[PDB]
Write a protein that binds this ligand. Structure first.
Ligand code: FAD
Ligand code: FAD
Ligand code: K17
Ligand code: K17
Ligand code: ZN
Ligand code: ZN
Lengths: 230, 230
């Protein structure tokens, strides 16, 4: 019936190819009757830095600042900064989290890295126990929709950049799998800037068309073998 | 004789293990007579977000903002924000760039990711063509000094996190190699929080010790095979 979707979106420009991918996702999921929420990081001027400002009140140890320990305690004592808890609420309510971003240095743009660093704290996303298959967000789906400057050719095992699955590893496995997400196959839109309209539209349509049956999909086996083998 | 080093340092707490590893680097490189500079990113409140504030001149396309295009042109024109060019000057003068950071989500902390996103712009760090072995920072060395929460065993091929080299790919190859750096072998200090006081002191001294002969080192072959195996 009614699945809830959070789109975490990281692009500066509404007219961008990333913006269109985000908008057709909102459009198509909305059409299906899904509950949809968008975190527009640049528009929110989202704070990427992990600092002691992320804890309100009294630090667990104001002499030596340990971010990980202090945020773990602030979570369990409900004293995290509100920009963080706002995002955790959106994530708690979502059944599927889509990340929409241009590839920046084989990874996410820093503003989105900061979202991962600050929002996915211990207590909330992971714990002992509860990581990988049993991470605290199990039951949820996650999907990386990434756009690139480099063509698909460049992202082959014999290409200069190596297989795109190589750079996926820290995101899909080290971050998403670690928190208990089932990981849906990445959506990779290769090299929009150098493409035609026929190809570009094609890529947007693939995405829109894929979203039509997203709820029927099987997760990938988020394994070293999936990423590095064959 | 006259080597110049830049340490790009990303930890909030001077008394931290990262702080100590950064201080022993400065101590030992300074002892050797090297020229040493540190960018203490949190202390500088370094801006991680790639935004249109990074360009102060007339935009090449004011209607649709394209960060990579606008910063490339701004670099040529000299209309980049001055925090960016301050860093570029440090890099340009360095013979060796050391990155000192705790592993955050199989990667660098967002404030450091932002340094990479914003500082290594087209025209300065790379060109098209002019990347990988043709990168503009060719002739320079780079080295990742990483600390982890995870133990070394967790970071092996058969361990839960996979081999440590797997997560190095986006950083060593996708970023440093792409810009033309030769990459020295990573320094990874595993699980200092778990370690005994003696093991901690030893890990610090192992780093100091290595630094005594850093200038005699050859780089790694920064290739898929090195990172992933056969
Ligand atoms: C700091 C930095 C680091 C980077 N690192 C990497 C890297 O490691 N690897 C890599 O491969 N690339 C890298 N890039 C390149 C970057 O990933 C690409 O520039 C980015 O993915 C392009 O996506 P976009 O949404 O910004 O494209 P846009 O320029 O915004 O859009 C492409 C074109 O599509 C058009 N368009 C918009 N909407 C539609 C629509 N609905 N239908 C048809 N056309 C439409 C736009 O008008 C535009 O002309 C990096 C770039 C930067 C700035
Ligand atoms: C957002 C986030 C994401 C993370 N993601 C990952 C991840 O993906 N993978 C992973 O493995 N880990 C991860 N971690 C854990 C993180 O990498 C470790 O907490 C970090 O590497 C520890 O380094 P530190 O400098 O902060 O240790 P500290 O806590 O500062 O140091 C540990 C101990 O060393 C002591 N010490 C300091 N100086 C000396 C000295 N000179 N001699 C002896 N002892 C000394 C300190 O006092 C302290 O007791 C993450 C943490 C956070 C907050
Ligand atoms: Br493959 C690659 C590409 Br194609 C681009 Br445009 C880029 N811009 C900044 N870093 C990069 C990389 Br690593
Ligand atoms: Br060991 C470890 C790992 Br392996 C990850 Br992926 C992580 N994310 C936040 N903290 C951590 C730790 Br402490
Ligand atoms: Zn996995
Ligand atoms: Zn390489």
């Amino acid at each position: 019936a009614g699945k809830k979707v959070l789109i975490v979106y990281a692009h500066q420009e509404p007219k961008s190819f990333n913006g269109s991918l985000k908008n057709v996702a909102v459009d198509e999921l909305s059409r299906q009757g899904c509950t949809v929420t968008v975190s527009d990081l640049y528009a929110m001027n989202f704070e990427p830095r992990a600092t002691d400002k992320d804890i309100t009140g009294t630090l667990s140890n104001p002499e030596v600042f340990n971010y990980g320990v202090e945020t773990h305690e602030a979570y369990k004592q409900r004293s995290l900064a509100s920009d963080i808890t706002d995002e955790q609420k959106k994530v708690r309510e979502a059944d599927l989290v889509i990340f929409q971003f241009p590839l920046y240095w084989f990874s996410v743009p820093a503003i989105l890295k900061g979202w991962m660093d600050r929002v996915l704290c211990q207590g909330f996303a992971f714990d002992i126990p509860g990581f990988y298959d049993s991470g605290l967000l199990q039951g949820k789906l996650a999907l990386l929709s990434v756009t690139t400057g480099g063509t698909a050719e460049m992202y082959t095992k014999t290409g200069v950049n190596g297989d795109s699955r190589y750079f996926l590893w820290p995101l899909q496995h080290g971050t998403l799998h670690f928190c208990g997400f089932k990981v849906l196959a990445p959506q990779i839109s290769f090299a929009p800037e150098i493409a035609s309209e026929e190809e570009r539209k094609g890529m947007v349509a693939a995405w829109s068309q894929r979203l039509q049956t997203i709820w029927k999909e099987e997760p990938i086996p988020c394994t070293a073998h999936w990423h590095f083998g064959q």
